[PDB]
Design a protein around this ligand. Sequence first.
Ligand SMILES: *[C@@H]1O[C@H](CO)[C@@H](O[C@@H]2O[C@H](CO)[C@@H](O[C@@H]3O[C@H](CO)[C@@H](O[C@H]4O[C@H](CO)[C@@H](O)[C@H](O)[C@@H]4O)[C@H](O)[C@@H]3O)[C@H](O)[C@H]2NC(C)=O)[C@H](O)[C@H]1NC(C)=O
Ligand SMILES: *[C@@H]1O[C@H](CO)[C@@H](O[C@@H]2O[C@H](CO)[C@@H](O[C@H]3O[C@H](CO)[C@@H](O[C@@H]4O[C@H](CO)[C@@H](O)[C@H](O)[C@@H]4O)[C@H](O)[C@@H]3O)[C@H](O)[C@H]2NC(C)=O)[C@H](O)[C@H]1NC(C)=O
Ligand SMILES: *[C@@H]1O[C@H](CO)[C@@H](O[C@@H]2O[C@H](CO)[C@@H](O)[C@H](O)[C@H]2NC(C)=O)[C@H](O)[C@H]1NC(C)=O
Ligand SMILES: OC[C@H]1O[C@](O)(CO)[C@@H](O)[C@@H]1O
Ligand SMILES: [Fe+3]
Ligand SMILES: [Zn+2]
Ligand SMILES: [Zn+2]
Length: 341
Amino acid sequence: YTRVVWCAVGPEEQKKCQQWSQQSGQNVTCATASTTDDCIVLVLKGEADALNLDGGYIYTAGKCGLVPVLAENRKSSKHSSLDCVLRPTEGYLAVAVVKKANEGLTWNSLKDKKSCHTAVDRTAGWNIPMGLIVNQTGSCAFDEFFSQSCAPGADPKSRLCALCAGDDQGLDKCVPNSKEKYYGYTGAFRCLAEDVGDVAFVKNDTVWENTNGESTADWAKNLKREDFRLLCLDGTRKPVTEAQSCHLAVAPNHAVVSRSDRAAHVEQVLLHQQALFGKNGKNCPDKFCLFKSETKNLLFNDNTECLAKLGGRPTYEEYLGTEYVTAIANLKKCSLEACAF
Ligand SMILES: *[C@@H]1O[C@H](CO)[C@@H](O[C@@H]2O[C@H](CO)[C@@H](O[C@@H]3O[C@H](CO)[C@@H](O[C@H]4O[C@H](CO)[C@@H](O)[C@H](O)[C@@H]4O)[C@H](O)[C@@H]3O)[C@H](O)[C@H]2NC(C)=O)[C@H](O)[C@H]1NC(C)=O
Ligand SMILES: *[C@@H]1O[C@H](CO)[C@@H](O[C@@H]2O[C@H](CO)[C@@H](O[C@H]3O[C@H](CO)[C@@H](O[C@@H]4O[C@H](CO)[C@@H](O)[C@H](O)[C@@H]4O)[C@H](O)[C@@H]3O)[C@H](O)[C@H]2NC(C)=O)[C@H](O)[C@H]1NC(C)=O
Ligand SMILES: *[C@@H]1O[C@H](CO)[C@@H](O[C@@H]2O[C@H](CO)[C@@H](O)[C@H](O)[C@H]2NC(C)=O)[C@H](O)[C@H]1NC(C)=O
Ligand SMILES: OC[C@H]1O[C@](O)(CO)[C@@H](O)[C@@H]1O
Ligand SMILES: [Fe+3]
Ligand SMILES: [Zn+2]
Ligand SMILES: [Zn+2]
C-alpha cells in the first residue's frame, strides 16, 4: 500500500535517492535508469512509481497514460497569503543567454553559431528554441542550423553532440543525464560560461543562481551577471534583469508524474515526505533536505520551495496548456497520436 518507488536518472540522482530512502525508513525506495525515457518505461511497467519531470517529457509520458500529481513551486511575491502547497504555479521563463563580450550576436544572427541545450525533448532547452527556429526557417533541418552543439540525447556521432564532454573520463558523451558535463540547466549554462558554446537555452533562474558568487563552484564563482545578455525575439539584446520583457516563452513547471492508478498514493506519501524533508521540514536542515543538491538540480530543482497540489485535477494536456501542446506537436511532425513506446 504505502511504499513509493522513485525513479532516479543516472548515478548522481541514485545516490541522493538512496539517502532519501535511508532517511525515510524505506517509505521511499529507488529504481535507476540511464535516461528519462527509460524511467518512464519503468513507471509504465509498474516497477517504479514516480519521478519529477520537465514539461517536455510530460508530453511524452502523457501520450503513454501517465498523469501529473504534484508540481514544483519556487519563491514568489504574488499570492503571498496562500500556503506553498495551495498556491498556484507561475511557470518559468525560457531564455536565450549569451556572453556580453559577444557583440553583434542576436536572435537573427544565430545561423551557424554554437549552441548549448539542456537536452533533447525538454522545454527551454529544446522544444521552445527549435520550434521557433523550424517555424521561422520553414524547414525541419534543425540538425543543420547550428554549426555545432551539445544537445544531450542526440546521436553521439552527430554535430548536435559535438560540444558535449561526457564524464570525468570522457565516457557517456552526450548521454541525457547528469553524467554529461553539459547536461541540464546547469550543464548548458556552464557550456556557455566556459565559452564552449555561443548561446545556451536555459531558463532565467539559471543565470541568477550561478552568477555573482551564488554557486561557488570552480567554474562559476567568478561569473558576473553583467557579462551576460538575453536574446529577445525582436532582435534586441537586454540585461538578465529584463527577463519579463525578453523571453522565448513561459514554461510550465516541472511536476511529479505517476501511473493514474497510483497517483493518489504517490501524492499522499510525498506530501508527508515533504513535511519531513521540505523547505521547513521537521528534519531538512538537520538530517536531510529533499530540495538541496548543491546547484545540481537532482530529483528536484534546488529552487523548489515545495511540491504543490494541482487543483482542477488536470490532465496532462491541461497542465501543459494548449499553447505549449501545439508547439510540441508541430515540431514532432518533423522527426500523430500514440506514445513512443
Ligand atoms: C509554429 O508555427 C505553427 C504554425 O503557425 C504554430 O501552430 C499553430 O499555433 C497556433 C497558436 O499557437 C494555433 O492557433 C490558434 O491559437 C489561438 C490562440 O490561442 C486559439 O484561439 C484563441 O484566440 C481567440 C482570439 O479571439 C481568443 O480570444 C481565445 O481565447 C483563444 O485563446 C485557437 O484555438 C488556435 O489554437 C494553431 O492550432 C497551430 N496551427 C497548426 C497548423 O498546428 C506553432 O504554435 C508555432 N510553434 C511555436 C513553438 O511557436
Ligand atoms: C529571474 O530569476 C530570479 C531567480 O530565479 C527571480 O528572482 C529572485 O526573486 C525572488 C522573489 O521573486 C527571490 O526570493 C525572494 O527571497 C527573499 C526572502 O526569501 C525576499 O525578501 C522579501 O522579504 C520581505 C519581508 O517582508 C518582503 O518584502 C517579501 O516577503 C520578499 O519576498 C527577496 O527580496 C526575494 O524576492 C530571490 O531572492 C531572487 N533571486 C536572486 C538570486 O536574486 C527573478 O524574479 C527572475 N526574473 C523574473 C522576470 O522573474
Ligand atoms: C514512514 O511513513 C509512515 C506513513 O506516513 C510514517 O509512519 C507512521 O507514523 C504515523 C504517525 O505516528 C502513523 O500514522 C503511521 O501509521 C505509522 N506507521 C507505522 C505503523 O509505523 C513515518 O513517518 C515514515 N517514517 C519515516 C522514517 O519518515
Ligand atoms: O505559466 C502558464 C501555466 O500556468 C497555468 O496558467 C496555471 O497553473 C497553466 O495552465 C500554464 O501552463
Ligand atoms: Fe524544464
Ligand atoms: Zn511572454
Ligand atoms: Zn480538466
